[PDB]
Each structure stands twice: as structure tokens, then as C-alpha cells.
Amino acid sequence: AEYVRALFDFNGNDEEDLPFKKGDILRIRDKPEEQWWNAEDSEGKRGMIPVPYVEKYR
């Protein structure tokens, strides 16, 4: 599994987006395009996240 750490807050704009806060750890579910990935948060919510706002987390 791949997890990322949010570097910035993301409020979301489109219905499909997953909003998150700086420091949130998100699971990556799939990578449909280079800069937008499908992720899930600890509350079970799913949606698209901007790849430039996150960092690999180990």
C-alpha cells in the first residue's frame, strides 16, 4: 500500500475532490492521471487529491 502526507490544506473545488488538512495521512487507491490521484482518508471518505500537495510517507 502507498500512503502520502499532506503538505498543505486542500479545501476541494469539484464534487469529486477529497478535502484534507496539512499533515493528514491519506491512502492512495489508484492513479488515473499524473497529478490527480484517488485517495481515502481515515474516516473512509474517498476522492481525488492534487499530487503536488502531498509527499511520500513511510
Binding site: 492521471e33 497529478q35 490527480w36 492534487p50 503536488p52 500537495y53
Partner: peptide
């Protein structure tokens, strides 16, 4: 590093 611009959404796989 600052904060990078929000990326455009493109055609998906």
C-alpha cells in the same frame, strides 16, 4: 518551496 499551483485536471486512464 512555497506552495505549488493547483494542477489542471486532464484525461484519465
Amino acid at each position: 518551496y512555497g506552495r505549488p499551483p493547483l494542477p489542471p485536471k486532464q484525461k484519465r486512464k
